[PDB]
Design a protein around this motif. Structure first.
Motif, mmCIF file in Angstrom:
data_model
loop_
_atom_site.group_PDB
_atom_site.id
_atom_site.type_symbol
_atom_site.label_atom_id
_atom_site.label_comp_id
_atom_site.label_asym_id
_atom_site.label_seq_id
_atom_site.Cartn_x
_atom_site.Cartn_y
_atom_site.Cartn_z
ATOM 1 N N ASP A 16 0.822 -1.204 0.000
ATOM 2 C CA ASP A 16 0.000 0.000 0.000
ATOM 3 C C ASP A 16 0.858 1.256 0.000
ATOM 4 O O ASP A 16 0.410 2.317 -0.452
ATOM 5 C CB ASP A 16 -0.929 -0.003 1.214
ATOM 6 N N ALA A 17 2.087 1.157 0.503
ATOM 7 C CA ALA A 17 2.975 2.317 0.576
ATOM 8 C C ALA A 17 3.653 2.592 -0.763
ATOM 9 O O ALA A 17 3.366 3.592 -1.427
ATOM 10 C CB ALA A 17 4.014 2.105 1.682
ATOM 11 N N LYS A 99 -5.198 1.955 -3.478
ATOM 12 C CA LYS A 99 -4.620 0.984 -4.397
ATOM 13 C C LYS A 99 -5.432 -0.300 -4.487
ATOM 14 O O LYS A 99 -5.202 -1.094 -5.406
ATOM 15 C CB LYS A 99 -3.188 0.644 -3.977
ATOM 16 N N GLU A 174 5.872 5.074 4.103
ATOM 17 C CA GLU A 174 5.362 6.436 4.004
ATOM 18 C C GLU A 174 5.429 7.185 5.330
ATOM 19 O O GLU A 174 4.746 8.199 5.500
ATOM 20 C CB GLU A 174 3.922 6.423 3.489
HETATM 21 CA CA LIG Z 1 2.139 5.870 -2.381
#
Ligand SMILES: [Ca+2]
Ligand SMILES: [Ca+2]
Length: 289
Positions: A16-17, A99, A174
């Motif tokens: 997800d990052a 995402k 993140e």
């Molecule tokens: Ca990103």
DNA sequence: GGGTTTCCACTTATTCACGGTTTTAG
DNA sequence: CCTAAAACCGTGAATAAGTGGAAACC
């Protein structure tokens, strides 16, 4: 080099990052339908964190690592049968950011290519419709070649953090551990834990304050979740990531962050010898590392 | 083998990670 | 008065994605 397995929720959180999907539709004169395709999932990181790509590849036994420039390294998962391993992983451990919609359309193109329908123009037209609601959209060349329309409108994803391991994987990518030295006379060292994300995940960013029970949201796109109260940091922020181990070079930054947190807990940050020692730990971490 | 996959090199648009200050809280 | 927690800045680059090219496959 031996590599190590990564927690699948920490992996799904890291996906997800810094993860990304790709769907290529290229003009190929040698192709029968006139256009070949390539589908898969990829991650691009800096050379200092290339060990993550090796550990991610060791956990999945798929994908290939190649240098993505002079100061970049990439991992690409393009083999069709190997994509089933990445698909079955995400079905059990789903995505939580914006995402997840990209992965839903990633499966929607795998299914078209699963039935070998990507060799006919009728099936290729379906792949063109999938690429519209996903990614950055179609290029000008693909839009001119296909005047057909597609209707879906990628809906905003509304999901909540499943567990802390997802947050550990997401914060490893993140998250920022910063030691703020505010300037003043007489003889201020502040600890901040900010996380930057786009406005499209404001539903998740707003839930992040309630999930951890602290923090405030700053405000162009952008967004920011910041926590500054040392009571919340030393009791709710620092022990959460200590239980769910991080990944990458940010762990060493977190390790050096806890050292400055212990000094503030002992209130030794006001001493000249303590403030001088903080400068050594601050300069040798984060961008300086 | 003739289209078809999969791999390596390499690039581009922008959200990052990250720093520093000025100002209010209590 | 004091140190803390909040508010405002600001940008370079590591990202999130992308293409060209040819090998490798069956
Ligand atoms: Ca990103
Ligand atoms: Ca990062």
């Amino acid at each position: 080099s031996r590599r190590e397995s990564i927690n699948p929720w920490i992996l799904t959180g890291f996906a997800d990052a810094e993860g990304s999907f790709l769907l290529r539709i290229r003009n190929n004169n040698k192709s029968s339908v006139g256009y070949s395709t390539e589908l898969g999932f990829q991650i691009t990181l800096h050379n200092k964190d290339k060990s993550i790509l090796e550990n991610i590849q060791s956990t999945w036994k798929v994908g290939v690592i190649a240098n993505s420039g002079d100061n970049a390294v990439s991992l690409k998962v393009t083999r069709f049968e190997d994509l089933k391993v990445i698909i079955d992983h995400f079905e059990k451990y789903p995505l939580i950011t914006q995402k997840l919609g990209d992965y839903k359309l990633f499966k929607q193109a795998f299914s078209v290519m699963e039935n070998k329908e990507h060799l006919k123009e009728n099936g290729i037209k379906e792949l063109v419709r999938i690429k519209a609601k996903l990614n950055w959209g179609l290029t000008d060349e693909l839009k001119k070649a296909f005047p057909e329309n597609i209707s879906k409108e990628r809906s905003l994803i509304n999901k909540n953090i499943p567990n802390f391991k997802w947050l550990a994987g997401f914060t490893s990518g993140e998250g920022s551990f910063g030691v703020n030295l505010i300037k003043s006379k007489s003889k201020q060292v502040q600890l901040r834990f900010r996380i930057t994300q786009h406005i499209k995940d404001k539903n998740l960013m707003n839930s992040l304050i309630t999930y951890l029970g602290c923090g405030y949201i700053a405000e162009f796109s952008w967004l920011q979740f910041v926590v500054t109260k040392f009571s919340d940091i030393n009791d709710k922020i620092i022990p959460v990531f200590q239980e769910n181990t991080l990944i990458g070079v940010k762990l060493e930054d977190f390790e050096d962050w806890c050292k400055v947190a212990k000094l503030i807990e002992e209130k030794k940050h006001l001493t000249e010898s303590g403030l001088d020692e903080i400068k050594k730990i601050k300069l040798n971490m984060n961008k300086g590392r």
